[PDB]
Amino acid sequence: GKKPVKVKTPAGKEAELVPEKVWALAPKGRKGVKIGLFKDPETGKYFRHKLPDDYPI
DNA sequence: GTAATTGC
DNA sequence: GTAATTGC
């Protein structure tokens, strides 16, 4: 389930974007975080950003 | 270092 | 090959 995520673009605007790809980033034995790959919708620049912990992977 | 991911 | 992304 790839629902939109409220993120801040590297331009500095709040935007609800569907991530292109999501995965967990976690050392062994750690909870870690969830990461998404996003494309800025007007500049076209790719960037990574943390996702909420409840986001489906 | 660490964990995975991938556009650059 | 690795910058950049979180958290410890």
Residue numbers in the entry: 4 to 60
Which passages does the manuscript contain on this structure?
In Sulfolobus solfataricus P2, a model strain of Crenarchaeota, Cren7 is synthesized in abundance, constituting ~1% of the total cellular proteins. Similar to other Cren7-DNA complexes reported previously, Cren7 binds to the mismatched DNA duplex in the minor groove as a monomer, covering almost all the eight base pairs.
In the crystal of Cren7-GTAATTGC, one protein-DNA complex is found in the asymmetric unit. The hydrogen bond from G-O6 to T-N3 has been broken, whereas the G-N1 to T-O2 hydrogen bond (2.75 Å) remains intact. Only three residues on the loop, A29, P30 and K31, are involved in protein-DNA contacts, whereas the hydrogen bonds between the side chain of R33 and the bases of G1 and C16 no longer exist. By contrast, the binding affinity of Cren7 for GTAATTGC was 4.6-fold lower than that for the matched DNA.
